[PDB]
Write a protein that binds this ligand. Structure first.
Ligand SMILES: *[C@@H]1O[C@H](CO)[C@@H](O[C@@H]2O[C@H](CO)[C@@H](O)[C@H](O)[C@H]2NC(C)=O)[C@H](O)[C@H]1NC(C)=O
Ligand code: NAG
Ligand code: NAG
Ligand code: NAG
Lengths: 229, 199
């Protein structure tokens, strides 16, 4: 589940199998020639599924990833505030180590890097609502506010087909790029980290889409490769 | 402190069992029920979130189990597979006391055994063999003589784990009505009687 804390969560669990991720269509980072992306977005209405929270979904971080993620703004219900799945980069996911969190809310990309107590079954809702229960937790619980080294909001292009992220790390420094079109790239943020990130995860996005609606979260990611000359 | 009591401890197939909890902590974050001696999330049956008055299911949920706000869990149609230990886990803020467990046992009601005889009208100073025959492997086998427990004695032998009763010399004081009965922590049935007239 990598993630040690047992969160108290508003979601059912089942032991169903899950189809393998479905395939696409000096120092330099790129994706390979005829590379093939895999969709890691998972979705439920009601329950999460325990097999969601292990490999191949929990994936090796290596030399980074290039990702493109559908904007589900328009297929979410009325009050919804998260328009696409949150991703989580880190190592052991414990209070002993830094985890990058990139989570949209409304018009913003909430970026943060902290020592999070991440859940066993971390997830995200398109329209999260707790009937005033502070004990409840979705993807983390921290009774103490954790040491962060970056908590910064960035602006999201609310009306835009798909977003394009690049995440890598060199000399301990994580680098984040964003765009809303494939013709451009814009520096998001970068921060130095004491650990080195070895794993990543796209949290299951659960949502009650309204009417006869194809709720198709997609989070396609290919890896990056390193090369020094 | 929190104890837990199976009502009943011995349940017949296709009957209900209530894991009755005395006596929950009054302000809990959540509490859950698990299959067996464990709090492994894959053995979680159902779960309750007290502040949200909402219940949730887990991998071990079979569809015939109800969790109550008061800690208790209701099984509906027990199957031999349901029999075992069950673990109640209680989470406060944010410490969890694993440390209610309960064990219950399920059994099939026994069917009527059949009593078999060599001669029904056996002669004095000759052996009789009585055989209690049933379709109840794993039932207990008791012998009856005139409705009361049969007195063991010295010249009686019981073999095949109480299946066959043998009495070599039958003195006149062995005349009467013989039955076997198979028991089972949830059922008792008595065999057809057999009447030895030692002539
Ligand atoms: C906790 O709730 C359960 C379910 O309501 C109670 O179990 C019942 O006991 C009542 C008497 O209070 C009986 O009328 C019912 O027959 C029992 N439940 C059945 C048939 O499932 C339990 O006693 C409650 N009280 C506690 C734990 O103190
Ligand atoms: C990010 O967005 C949310 C929107 O409610 C806000 O509460 C929070 O303060 C923002 N973070 C920063 C660093 O401004
Ligand atoms: C579960 O196992 C532990 C092992 O030490 C024991 O203390 C406990 O009594 C067990 N539960 C039972 C037997 O119901
Ligand atoms: C949960 O609560 C509802 C509402 O009282 C009830 O109908 C349902 O049977 C309960 N489910 C479980 C699995 O306990």
């Amino acid at each position: 589940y990598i993630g040690d804390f047992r969160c108290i969560q508003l979601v059912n669990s089942n032991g169903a199998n899950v189809s393998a991720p479905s395939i696409s269509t000096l120092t330099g980072y790129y994706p390979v020639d005829g590379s093939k992306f895999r969709n890691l977005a998972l979705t439920g209405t009601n329950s999460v599924s325990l097999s969601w929270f292990q490999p191949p979904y929990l994936s090796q971080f290596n030399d980074g990833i290039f990702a493109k993620v559908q904007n589900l703004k328009t297929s979410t219900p009325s009050g919804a505030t998260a328009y696409f799945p949150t991703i989580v980069i880190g190592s052991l996911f414990g209070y002993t180590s830094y985890t990058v969190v990139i989570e949209p809310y409304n018009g913003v990309i909430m970026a943060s890097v902290c020592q999070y107590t991440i859940c066993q079954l971390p997830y995200t809702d398109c329209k999260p609502n707790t009937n005033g229960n502070k004990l409840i937790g979705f993807w983390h619980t921290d009774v103490k506010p954790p040491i962060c080294v970056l908590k910064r909001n960035f602006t999201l292009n609310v009306n835009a087909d798909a977003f394009y992220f690049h995440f890598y790390q060199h000399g301990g420094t994580f680098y984040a790029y964003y765009a809303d079109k494939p013709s451009a790239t814009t520096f998001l943020f970068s921060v130095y980290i004491g650990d080195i990130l070895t794993q990543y995860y796209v949290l299951p996005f659960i949502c009650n889409p309204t009417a006869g609606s194809t709720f198709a979260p997609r989070y396609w990611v290919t890896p990056l490769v390193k090369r020094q000359y | 402190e929190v104890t837990i009591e199976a009502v009943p401890p011995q349940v017949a197939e296709d009957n209900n069992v209530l894991l009755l909890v005395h006596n929950l902590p009054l302000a809990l974050g959540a509490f859950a029920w698990y299959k067996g001696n464990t709090t492994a999330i894959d053995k979680e049956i159902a779960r309750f979130v007290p502040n949200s008055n909402m219940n949730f299911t887990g991998q071990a949920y079979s569809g015939r189990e109800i969790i109550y706000s008061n800690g208790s869990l209701l099984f509906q149609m027990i199957t031999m597979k349901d029999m075992g230990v069950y673990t109640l886990d209680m989470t406060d803020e944010n410490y969890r006391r694993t440390q209610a467990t309960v064990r219950f046992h399920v059994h099939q009601p026994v069917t009527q055994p059949f009593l078999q005889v060599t001669n029904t009208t056996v002669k004095e100073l000759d052996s009789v063999t009585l055989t209690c025959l049933s379709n109840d492997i794993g039932a207990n086998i008791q012998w009856l003589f005139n409705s009361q427990s049969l007195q063991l004695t010295e010249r009686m032998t019981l073999s095949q784990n109480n299946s066959i009763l043998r009495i070599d010399p039958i003195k006149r004081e062995d005349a009467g009505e013989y039955q076997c009965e198979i028991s089972n922590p949830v059922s008792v049935r008595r065999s057809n009687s057999i009447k030895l007239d030692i002539i």
